[PDB]
Amino acid sequence: EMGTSVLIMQPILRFLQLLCENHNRDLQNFLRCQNNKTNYNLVCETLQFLDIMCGSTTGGLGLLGLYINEDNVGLVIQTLETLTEYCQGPCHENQTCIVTHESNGIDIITALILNDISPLCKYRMDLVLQLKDNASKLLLALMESRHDSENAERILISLRPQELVDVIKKAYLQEEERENSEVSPREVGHNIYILALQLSRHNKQLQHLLKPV
Amino acid sequence: SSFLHIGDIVSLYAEGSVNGFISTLGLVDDRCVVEPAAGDLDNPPKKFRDCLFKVCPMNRYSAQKQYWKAKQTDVVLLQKLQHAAQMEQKQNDTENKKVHGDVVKYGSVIQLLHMKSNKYLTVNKRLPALLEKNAMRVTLDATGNEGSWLFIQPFWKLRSNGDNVVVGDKVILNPVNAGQPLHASNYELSDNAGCKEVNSVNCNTSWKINLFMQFRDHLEEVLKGGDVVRLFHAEQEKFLTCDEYKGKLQVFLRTTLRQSATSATSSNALWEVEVVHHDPCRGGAGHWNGLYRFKHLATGNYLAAEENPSIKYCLVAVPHGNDIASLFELDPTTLQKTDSFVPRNSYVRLRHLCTNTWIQSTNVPIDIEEERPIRLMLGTCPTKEDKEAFAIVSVPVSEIRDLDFANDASSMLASAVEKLNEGFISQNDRRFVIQLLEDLVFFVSDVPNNGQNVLDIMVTKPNRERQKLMREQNILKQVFGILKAPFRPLVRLEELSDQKNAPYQHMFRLCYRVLRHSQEDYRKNQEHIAKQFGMMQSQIGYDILAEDTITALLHNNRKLLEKHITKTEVETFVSLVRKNREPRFLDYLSDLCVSNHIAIPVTQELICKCVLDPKNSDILIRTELRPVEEEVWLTWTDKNNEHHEKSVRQLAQEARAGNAHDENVLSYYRYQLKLFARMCLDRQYLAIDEISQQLGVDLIFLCMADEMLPFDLRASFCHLMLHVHV
Amino acid sequence: DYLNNVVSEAVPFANEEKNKLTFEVVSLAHNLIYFGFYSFSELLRLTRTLLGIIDCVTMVLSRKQSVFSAPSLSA
Amino acid sequence: LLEAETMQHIFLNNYQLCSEISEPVLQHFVHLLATHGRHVQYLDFLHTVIKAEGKYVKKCQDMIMTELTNAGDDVVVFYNDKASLAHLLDMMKAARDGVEDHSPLMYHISLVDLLAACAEGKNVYTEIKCTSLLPLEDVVSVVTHEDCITEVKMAYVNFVNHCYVDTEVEMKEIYTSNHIWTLFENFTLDMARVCSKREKRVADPTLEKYVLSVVLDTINAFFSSPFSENSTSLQTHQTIVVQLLQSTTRLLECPWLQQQHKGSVEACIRTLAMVAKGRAILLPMDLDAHISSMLS
Ligand SMILES: O=P(O)(O)O[C@@H]1[C@H](O)[C@H](O)[C@@H](OP(=O)(O)O)[C@H](OP(=O)(O)O)[C@H]1O
């Protein structure tokens, strides 16, 4: 069972997401920071919550699947969606904060996209597919209009090119899982491949790998 | 005054129930104690290096804790947890490097790492303090855990949370998890006299932090007070040594036959440099102008100069360094950076401040009585010679830590030997001895402890320093005592297999494993251990792993085999085989006969005399020919003095049918032929004559031709024919 | 005769005890040959069997001067 | 101490609670036993949770065994050394009229009973773990002593039955050693003492319970196990089997035997009979006839 304090986060996360809907830059900036004597950044707290739930470095080291379970998978997806809403618009400051945060949440997002949650996937593939889709959406939003390659460099540091090429190939070959699934694995693979092209524009190895036979 | 920073070396002085410095009882023990009688703030304890701690930042043990939990209670999961723990360790190291030099503030988390033992102080909320039941337990842990976290809090109302900690301020150390402040209780340990336990319990005790050394001064490129150094005389290429000659400690220059004088390293040559400071508890990096003292690590005496009996003044060791005589001054032998700090591994010239005389090496030996004197007298003279200069060589902290561990282990094993000699040893003491023996096994083997069985450890390359420490620090002697005392009432060799004696069995196998590991590729240790060959043989035949040590000691060692083997060893072997009538002992004799596939004339002749002597013929099976053309017959006499005679073909038939007695007799006979053949190797005519008299060419041909006999028996007969006759 | 028996049978190295006995037999043959007991014609009639043995289908090591060395007038 | 009784009563015959008892509760109880002191209430709470509604909880047994052995000399106190045995005898000599409530002797008995109960599930982990703590030598030494009360004897017999005899794996000491035979001789002596006491119009309820509950079950388990039919060492000792047979059949012959506990007694006879025919031991004519009267 989930504690009351962790439970209350879900309505708070949904409310914050609703505030920043319609790509409202004003409310996104206000949530990130305010013209107040004491400033409290909400996007960093959301990233920290995602990191702690996913295990932070422990999760990013390949143990992400163990921490994620069906009971809190919904909360994980909710926080990922909230981060995506913060990033989209696009918001330069929110994306920079999320990518370059001390908690290293971007590592958790990359592990989520790359490392499948073995326990959840074994009995519920659909939740893992949706979670991967949300993580890919967040990463795409992070580099929606980031001409600078520093964010792409950070992502590549947290994520090797070969693993994206392999993951794209598997997602294309994972279409059989679409049966009784709302989200097509091939669609998620295509989004990941678009993100891979965006990274390849900065990375030569990913560009070479993405080229077909 | 100054603000305490991360990475500083400080000493804590409690002034609550008992006034004293917190310290440890040793490196093999995990108890922290306070000794009020040891010293005070004005007069620090003589062994001050045991009271020094380093302040370190907060560290993460979550992944390490998960790995430990997994180990306590699949393979891929364990590997992933190990990788996570390693990554956490690396991250902690990087963070500690980052936050190095930061100012400590009240309410923050600080970890105290003991310098001598390199173990973090820890408070366990799941265990009670030994002497005081209500209070929780405090112990030193090398790896560290969450219990090591401590909050530094203001003992004075003037100090407030968030303020910078100032050196010399009384503070309160509160364990984060336990939440009960440390306390210097009044309970006194039974084993140690004058030492009081430190336990976690609500109290009013306060710890006065004293800055022994600043973080900036803690650099390895400079000569720092408290460092252990070696004094090497460049002109004579000798290391200064202090040791007891007849009944008094004397200082001299040891003479070494090694190719490299610097390569000659001994415990007695270790000295500790202490920089004189206004504050008794303050060390810090030294300067050329500053005064210095040198303290003998092993004995604790201080170097000084005294009236020469006849070279006006002579160097000697005095019990106390507080006297002004022990003071010394250093003079550079080369250009220096505007009288900056003394560099590490720098040549210096020593002068006596009180007398204003410079040191000098004299050829007058101190041990002229000895056939080969090795001790050369040193003296201080008013005139200075540029040639006479002593270089200071820094020693790694790891070597000092290993030496201290060796000394403490030797002391504990000596105590255990005394207990065993008394005849009674407690179960907890036995468990502690077992644990220390396992630690010694892993320490000598120089292999990381990753849960592998201690008994079966393989080392790619021996560590010569560890083996030299084992020999010099008397650890091998304590191990020999551990092996000898229990068997001679407390425990019997025949009773070893009993479940009641299982822990003693494990202790003895651990001791023999230690002996085997210590003597790999070492002539001096090989001789020292082989001096107990009789004791090793006495324990042969029981599950004590003595066979492995015996084989390793004499394996591929012609000189050791020749020196340590006499008629007495073969007498013991033949007596044992007569008692047991076991072929394996004849196999041992055969192995003794030949080393490295080459016959050893001396031991070969000794075994020739012993085995072929008219006495002991009962164990030796007899072979004859019966017309019954002629059939080979074997006659054997059992230890009961009963004589049995059976044809070789009949014996083979009985062995084929499964008769245990005949099969055992045939195996003993085969080992007899093996021993005879090894006795006749490399043209040993003395035994060849006797064996030819016993067995002829025709007899061996008949035995080897007959196919009904066992194939291995025919092979042994063919081997004997090849050696003895062909 | 023993070398002939070993060569006659297929897969001679199958029964460990027989491998030990064959080792002893070949050691005896080697020692006798280096003592010169075997004649040159006998040596050929023997090396036929030895080659057949190695043809495709209590242990002490002693090594003398390298036998696979070109004989030389002065050693 | 007052909260321990309430905690025990909360979990008392409640399987759904005992089987779901969380680790922190057991850890807290063990720490109280270690740090706070050695009290019987904690042992009773630990014992009541292992067995609920008859069924044995394998989990609670496993955690209790794992945590109890971690703490030694403060929680699991045992008297195996000669000095410890002498101290135990000195303390017991004052309990001839009955074990005093809350005394250390009762704590030791409760600890032994809890350890035996933790192994009453044919387990392979707890049994080996507790075999080392209390060797058979100490058990036989404390049980064969002349000055021994019935409580400790019953506790030790229950331990050696559940922890040593009734096990899933072979134990070398039990069968390939002359230890259990002295226990059987002591059992025969106890049966003779029961007969003599009853003949004197007197009886000890504790002694009667000990002789009618644990000893018979221990003998049955020893003589009706897969590792006993081999009789690798049982062949050497045959007289003790006949002594046990005659003692048990004589006890059965007595009319005061209440029906409830007669069955097991009879069962023992059968088991011994099954051994006798297998072992080809000599039987007395009268005893053989009496046994054969009911064999068929
Ligand atoms: O070359 P080997 O045969 O190994 O002998 C070593 C060395 O040649 C000296 O005998 C001795 O040095 P000292 O005379 O200075 O003692 C050294 O002892 P050590 O192991 O104590 O250095 C030996 O180990």
CA-closest candidate to residue D48, choices D64, D72, D35: D64
Amino acid identity of residue A170, one-letter, is K
Report d(CA B229, CA B317) in Å as an integer.
Answer: 17
Number of residues that this document lists for chain B: 726
Residue B173 pairs in a beta bridge with B152
CA-closest candidate to residue B224, choices B329, B338, B336, B344: B344
Report d(CA A49, CA A38) in Å as an integer.
Answer: 21
Report d(CA A48, CA A45) in Å as an integer.
Answer: 5
Output b/e per residue, B235-247; b: 16+ Cβ within 10 A. eeebbbbbbeeee
- DSSP three-state, residue B337: coil
- DSSP three-state, residue D127: helix
Q: Tokens standing for A116?
A: 């499948």
Please check if B241 is assigned to a binding site.
Answer: no
Number of residues that this document lists for chain C: 75
- Helix extents (H) in B316-426: 397-422
D293 Cβ partners below 8 Å, 6+ apart?
A: none
Residue A163 pairs in a beta bridge with none
Beta strands B207-213; B228-233: pairing state: unpaired
Report d(CA B18, CA B188) in Å as an integer.
Answer: 11
Report d(CA A86, CA A95) in Å as an integer.
Answer: 8
B339 Cβ partners below 8 Å, 6+ apart?
A: B287, B288, B289
Chain D nearest C-alpha distance from B126 (Å): 6
Alpha carbon D58 to chain centroid, angstroms: 20
* DSSP E strand boundaries for B254-301: 270-275, 292-296
Q: To 10 degrees, the CA torsion angle through C14, C15, C16, C18? A: -110
Note whether B touches A: 3 CB pairs or more under 8 A. yes
Angle CA(A164)–CA(A165)–CA(A170) in degrees, nearest 5?
A: 90
> Is C60's CB within 8 Å of B726's CB?
no
CA-closest candidate to residue B367, choices B376, B354, B380: B376
> Is B726's CB within 8 Å of C23's CB?
no
Question: Running DSSP on this structure, what letter comes out for residue D135?
Answer: -
Taking a C-beta distance cutoff of 8 angstroms, is the pair B313, B355 a contact? yes
Kindly list the protein residues whose Cβ atom lies closer than 6 A to any atom of ligand 1: B 256-258, 264, 468, 523-524
Report d(CA B704, CA B718) in Å as an integer.
Answer: 6
Angle CA(B304)–CA(B306)–CA(B307) in degrees, nearest 5?
A: 165
Report d(CA D206, CA D212) in Å as an integer.
Answer: 10
The phi and psi torsions of B392 (rounded to 5 degrees) equal -100, 120
Chain B nearest C-alpha distance from C49 (Å): 20
B483 Cβ partners below 8 Å, 6+ apart?
A: B508, B511, B512, B535, B539
What is the Å distance from ligand 1's center to B255 Cα? 12
Chain D within 8 Å of B503 (Cβ-Cβ)? no
Angle CA(A154)–CA(A157)–CA(A158) in degrees, nearest 5?
A: 90
CA-closest candidate to residue B651, choices B641, B663, B642, B660: B663
- DSSP three-state, residue B39: coil
**Residue A138: C-alpha distances to residues A83, A130, B238 (Å):** 7, 12, 71
Angle CA(B355)–CA(B358)–CA(B359) in degrees, nearest 5?
A: 115
C43 Cβ partners below 8 Å, 6+ apart?
A: C33
Answer left, alpha or beta for residue B616, where phi above 0 means left and psi between -120 and 50 means alpha: left
Report d(CA D113, CA D99) in Å as an integer.
Answer: 15
Report d(CA D72, CA D70) in Å as an integer.
Answer: 6
Pairs across B and D, CB distance < 8 A: 21
Chain B within 8 Å of D38 (Cβ-Cβ)? no
Place of tokens 């013991």: B572
Taking a C-beta distance cutoff of 8 angstroms, is the pair A145, A90 a contact? yes
Chain D within 8 Å of B372 (Cβ-Cβ)? no
Question: Running DSSP on this structure, what letter comes out for residue B231?
Answer: E
What is the Å distance from ligand 1's center to B258 Cα? 6
Give the residue whose CA is nearest to atom 11 of ligand 1.
Answer: B258
C-beta atoms surrounding B486 within 10 Å:
22
Q: Tokens standing for B555?
A: 């394996």
In angstroms, how far apart are the furthest CA atoms of chain B?
115
> Is B80's CB within 8 Å of A57's CB?
no
Report d(CA C21, CA B670) in Å as an integer.
Answer: 14
* Distance, first Cα to last Cα, chain C: 37
- DSSP three-state, residue C74: coil
Burial class (CB in 10 A: 0-12, 13-18, 19+), B303: buried
Helix B567-580 to helix B583-593 angle (10° resolution) is 160
What is the Å distance from ligand 1's center to B468 Cα? 10
B20 Cβ partners below 8 Å, 6+ apart?
A: B13, B14, B34, B35, B36, B37, B38, B39, B184, B196
Taking a C-beta distance cutoff of 8 angstroms, is the pair D279, D230 a contact? no
Amino acid identity of residue A111, one-letter, is A
Report d(CA B402, CA B408) in Å as an integer.
Answer: 10
Report d(CA A151, CA B207) in Å as an integer.
Answer: 49
Angle CA(D55)–CA(D163)–CA(D194) in degrees, nearest 5?
A: 95
Report d(CA B147, CA B367) in Å as an integer.
Answer: 55
- Helix extents (H) in chain D: 2-10, 15-18, 23-31, 40-50, 58-70, 82-93, 104-118, 126-133, 136-144, 150-159, 172-175, 180-199, 205-223, 239-253, 262-279, 285-295
Taking a C-beta distance cutoff of 8 angstroms, is the pair B352, B384 a contact? no
The phi and psi torsions of D231 (rounded to 5 degrees) equal 55, 45
Report d(CA D70, CA D133) in Å as an integer.
Answer: 12
- DSSP three-state, residue B633: strand
Report d(CA A45, CA B282) in Å as an integer.
Answer: 46
Burial class (CB in 10 A: 0-12, 13-18, 19+), B337: exposed
Amino acid identity of residue B262, one-letter, is T
Burial class (CB in 10 A: 0-12, 13-18, 19+), D196: exposed
C-beta atoms surrounding B336 within 10 Å:
13
A174 Cβ partners below 8 Å, 6+ apart?
A: A185, A186, A189
Pairs across B and C, CB distance < 8 A: 43
- DSSP three-state, residue B37: helix
Helix B427-445 to helix B397-422 angle (10° resolution) is 140
Report chain B residues whose CB lies below 8 A from the CB of D67: none
DSSP string, B147-190: GG-EEEEESSSSS-TTPBPBTT-EEEEEETTT---EEEEEEE-S
Mutation for testing the D interface, residue in B431, B498, B500, B501 having most D CBs under 10 Å: B500
Report d(CA B652, CA B646) in Å as an integer.
Answer: 10
Q: What approach was used to elucidate this structure?
A: cryo-EM
**Residue A23: C-alpha distances to residues A20, A29, A143, B140, B252 (Å):** 6, 11, 15, 56, 85
Taking a C-beta distance cutoff of 8 angstroms, is the pair A19, A72 a contact? no
B157 Cβ partners below 8 Å, 6+ apart?
A: none
A20 Cβ partners below 8 Å, 6+ apart?
A: A27, A28, A31, A85, A86, A89
Q: Tokens standing for C13?
A: 């190295």
Q: Tokens standing for B378?
A: 């040193």
Q: Which of residues 119-138 of D touch B (CB under 8 A)?
A: 135, 137
Q: Tokens standing for C37?
A: 């007991």
Angle CA(B297)–CA(B303)–CA(B308) in degrees, nearest 5?
A: 145
Report d(CA D60, CA D49) in Å as an integer.
Answer: 7
What is the Å distance from ligand 1's center to B523 Cα? 9
Report d(CA D165, CA D218) in Å as an integer.
Answer: 7
* Distance, first Cα to last Cα, chain B: 93
Report d(CA B667, CA B661) in Å as an integer.
Answer: 10
Report d(CA B457, CA B446) in Å as an integer.
Answer: 10
The phi and psi torsions of D224 (rounded to 5 degrees) equal -135, 45
Burial class (CB in 10 A: 0-12, 13-18, 19+), B677: buried
Note whether C touches D: 3 CB pairs or more under 8 A. no
B144 Cβ partners below 8 Å, 6+ apart?
A: B59, B61, B111, B120, B122
Taking a C-beta distance cutoff of 8 angstroms, is the pair B183, B198 a contact? yes
DSSP string, A53-78: HHTTHHIIIIIHHHH--HHHHHHHHH
Q: Which of residues 14-43 of B touch D (CB under 8 A)?
A: none
C-beta atoms surrounding B522 within 10 Å:
17
C-beta atoms surrounding D285 within 10 Å:
7
CA closest to B670 among chain C residues: C58
Q: Tokens standing for B625?
A: 């020919």
D155 Cβ partners below 8 Å, 6+ apart?
A: D109, D112, D113, D116
Report d(CA B265, CA B268) in Å as an integer.
Answer: 9
State which H helix or E strand residue B390 sits in: strand B390-394
**Residue B368: C-alpha distances to residues B363, B365, B376, B622, D44 (Å):** 11, 6, 9, 61, 78
- DSSP three-state, residue B211: strand
In angstroms, how far apart are the furthest CA atoms of chain D?
63
Report d(CA D255, CA D198) in Å as an integer.
Answer: 11
CA-closest candidate to residue B706, choices B645, B641, B651: B651
Place of tokens 């135990």: D88
Residue B635 pairs in a beta bridge with B622, B645
Report d(CA B2, CA B24) in Å as an integer.
Answer: 27
A42 Cβ partners below 8 Å, 6+ apart?
A: A16, A31, A32
Report chain A residues whose CB lies below 8 A from the CB of B79: none
Report d(CA C41, CA C28) in Å as an integer.
Answer: 19
CA-closest candidate to residue B285, choices B333, B236, B341, B348: B341
What is the Å distance from ligand 1's center to B578 Cα? 41
State which H helix or E strand residue B645 sits in: strand B643-647
Chain B nearest C-alpha distance from D35 (Å): 5
DSSP string, B545-558: SHHHHHHHHHTT-H
Report chain B residues whose CB lies below 8 A from the CB of C5: none
Chain B nearest C-alpha distance from C26 (Å): 10
Please check if B488 is assigned to a binding site.
Answer: no
